[PDB]
Amino acid sequence: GSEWRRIAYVYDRQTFFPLLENGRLLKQEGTKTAPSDAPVLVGWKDGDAIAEMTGQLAELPAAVLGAMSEIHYKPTREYEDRVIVYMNDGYEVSATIRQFADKLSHYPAIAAALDRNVK
Protein backbone atom coordinates (compact mmCIF):
# COMPACT_ATOMS: atom_id res chain seq x y z
CA GLY A 1 0.00 0.00 0.00
CA SER A 2 1.04 3.59 -0.69
CA GLU A 3 1.56 6.26 1.97
CA TRP A 4 2.61 9.86 2.55
CA ARG A 5 6.22 10.97 2.99
CA ARG A 6 7.23 12.93 6.09
CA ILE A 7 8.61 16.36 5.25
CA ALA A 8 8.05 18.22 8.55
CA TYR A 9 7.18 17.92 12.24
CA VAL A 10 5.06 19.61 14.90
CA TYR A 11 6.35 20.77 18.28
CA ASP A 12 3.72 19.95 20.90
CA ARG A 13 3.71 18.40 24.37
CA GLN A 14 7.51 18.40 24.44
CA THR A 15 7.40 16.06 21.43
CA PHE A 16 7.79 16.42 17.66
CA PHE A 17 4.75 15.01 15.88
CA PRO A 18 5.76 13.66 12.40
CA LEU A 19 4.14 15.75 9.67
CA LEU A 20 3.37 14.19 6.27
CA GLU A 21 3.47 15.93 2.89
CA ASN A 22 -0.31 16.19 3.09
CA GLY A 23 -0.09 17.79 6.53
CA ARG A 24 -0.99 14.48 8.17
CA LEU A 25 0.00 15.36 11.72
CA LEU A 26 0.85 12.28 13.78
CA LYS A 27 0.33 13.21 17.43
CA GLN A 28 0.65 9.57 18.46
CA GLU A 29 3.83 9.11 16.41
CA GLY A 30 5.63 11.99 18.12
CA THR A 31 9.19 11.79 19.34
CA LYS A 32 11.06 13.32 22.27
CA THR A 33 13.94 14.32 20.00
CA ALA A 34 14.35 16.97 17.31
CA PRO A 35 14.56 15.24 13.87
CA SER A 36 17.51 16.76 12.01
CA ASP A 37 16.17 14.98 8.91
CA ALA A 38 13.08 17.19 8.78
CA PRO A 39 11.81 20.57 10.08
CA VAL A 40 9.53 21.20 13.05
CA LEU A 41 6.47 23.39 13.57
CA VAL A 42 6.71 25.35 16.83
CA GLY A 43 3.55 26.90 18.21
CA TRP A 44 0.65 25.65 16.09
CA LYS A 45 -2.99 25.44 17.16
CA ASP A 46 -4.50 25.51 13.66
CA GLY A 47 -3.70 22.22 11.95
CA ASP A 48 -5.21 23.82 8.87
CA ALA A 49 -2.25 26.17 8.88
CA ILE A 50 0.04 23.22 9.56
CA ALA A 51 -1.19 21.33 6.49
CA GLU A 52 -0.41 24.50 4.53
CA MET A 53 3.21 24.77 5.68
CA THR A 54 3.90 21.05 5.20
CA GLY A 55 2.33 21.39 1.77
CA GLN A 56 5.01 23.89 0.78
CA LEU A 57 7.66 21.48 2.08
CA ALA A 58 6.17 18.73 -0.09
CA GLU A 59 6.87 20.83 -3.19
CA LEU A 60 10.14 22.56 -2.30
CA PRO A 61 13.52 20.71 -2.44
CA ALA A 62 13.70 18.19 0.41
CA ALA A 63 17.26 19.36 1.10
CA VAL A 64 16.06 22.93 1.48
CA LEU A 65 13.32 22.09 3.98
CA GLY A 66 15.78 19.63 5.47
CA ALA A 67 18.20 22.44 6.26
CA MET A 68 16.56 23.70 9.45
CA SER A 69 16.22 22.71 13.11
CA GLU A 70 12.74 24.04 13.86
CA ILE A 71 10.22 26.59 12.59
CA HIS A 72 8.78 29.25 14.90
CA TYR A 73 5.29 30.57 14.16
CA LYS A 74 5.53 34.37 14.26
CA PRO A 75 2.53 35.98 12.47
CA THR A 76 2.04 39.71 12.04
CA ARG A 77 -0.66 42.26 11.23
CA GLU A 78 0.54 42.08 7.62
CA TYR A 79 1.44 38.36 7.55
CA GLU A 80 -0.88 36.08 9.53
CA ASP A 81 1.08 33.16 8.05
CA ARG A 82 4.55 34.51 8.83
CA VAL A 83 6.84 31.68 9.92
CA ILE A 84 10.43 32.09 11.12
CA VAL A 85 12.60 29.07 10.34
CA TYR A 86 15.82 28.19 12.17
CA MET A 87 18.54 27.17 9.71
CA ASN A 88 20.69 24.18 10.64
CA ASP A 89 23.73 26.45 10.31
CA GLY A 90 22.56 28.46 13.32
CA TYR A 91 20.83 31.33 11.52
CA GLU A 92 17.30 32.72 11.72
CA VAL A 93 15.27 33.12 8.53
CA SER A 94 11.72 34.31 7.88
CA ALA A 95 9.08 33.14 5.42
CA THR A 96 5.35 32.67 4.85
CA ILE A 97 3.17 29.57 4.61
CA ARG A 98 1.92 30.87 1.25
CA GLN A 99 5.39 31.21 -0.27
CA PHE A 100 7.43 29.12 2.18
CA ALA A 101 8.94 27.17 -0.70
CA ASP A 102 9.81 30.30 -2.66
CA LYS A 103 11.11 31.89 0.53
CA LEU A 104 13.66 29.15 1.20
CA SER A 105 14.00 28.33 -2.51
CA HIS A 106 15.69 31.68 -3.12
CA TYR A 107 18.36 30.68 -0.57
CA PRO A 108 21.56 29.69 -2.49
CA ALA A 109 23.08 28.15 0.64
CA ILE A 110 20.04 26.14 1.72
CA ALA A 111 19.28 24.87 -1.77
CA ALA A 112 23.01 24.15 -1.97
CA ALA A 113 22.19 21.09 0.15
CA LEU A 114 20.89 19.68 -3.13
CA ASP A 115 24.19 20.47 -4.86
CA ARG A 116 26.20 18.67 -2.18
CA ASN A 117 23.93 15.66 -1.78
CA VAL A 118 24.40 14.27 -5.29
CA LYS A 119 22.26 11.26 -6.18
In order of their start, the domains of the chain are 1-119 (3.40.50.10960)
Residues 6+ apart with CB under 8 A from 10: 16, 17, 19, 25, 27, 30, 40, 41, 44, 50
User: How far is Cα 5 from Cα 80, in angstroms, rounded to an integer?
Assistant: 27
CA angle at 21 for the pair 117 and 32, rounded to the nearest 5°: 80
Please check whether residue 27 is in contact with residue 17, taking contact to mean a CB–CB distance below 8 angstroms.
yes
Approach to solving: NMR
- Give CA separation, 86 vs 2, 4, 71, 91, 92, in Å: 31, 25, 6, 6, 5
